[PDB]
Amino acid sequence: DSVDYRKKGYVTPVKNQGQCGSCWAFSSVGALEGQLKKKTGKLLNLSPQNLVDCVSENDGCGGGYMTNAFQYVQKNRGIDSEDAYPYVGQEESCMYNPTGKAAKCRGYREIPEGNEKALKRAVARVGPVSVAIDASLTSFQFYSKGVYYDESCNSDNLNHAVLAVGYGIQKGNKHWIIKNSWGENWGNKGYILMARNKNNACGIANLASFPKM
């Protein structure tokens, strides 16, 4: 009763957003990449920078919503690849070119708010899902091993965007496998296991969505 999409080729390497508020763009490109692999049998790194620069409804390096990024890729008729529109860590003018186009989107669906059952179904039936969490605690930041649970985590304080790449159980502890964008150096090779079915720990199911392809 588990899945790990890193084993299935749905997940690109861990990235480092640096000192830009673009976690949302990495979340979005990660969910898009998964769907590229689901639909086509192959994926590639997609461009966070395209999103930071071209999604005007978001705040570039000052934050943004994944749903807005998916809406943008749909309306735009594409998103460039990372290699075609590479990541520079700051907002620049929108320089999207359809010649670099690597993925398309025909909408998105939002998981019902606070429902981890629905989220589990979504991860099983779609693949990697974009989620948002309270990552503000010192204990999240210094995570290294095991299943992260902190009683101080605030589910109404969503301040960081990440990506659910699977679920399972470790040492009796149900978990979400979370891909972050703080470099491979952070956590466990850029990954964190977060508590699953512990009353929506850190608001994991409060802002969950995936792109349609």
Ligand SMILES: N#Cc1nc(CCCN2CCCCC2)cc(C2CCCCCC2)n1
């Ligand atoms: N990276 C990323 C990222 N950075 C910010 C900027 C805040 C900077 N802030 C400055 C003071 C210290 C704490 C961080 C906001 C968000 C999103 C949160 C998750 C869901 C809703 C969408 C917005 N993500």
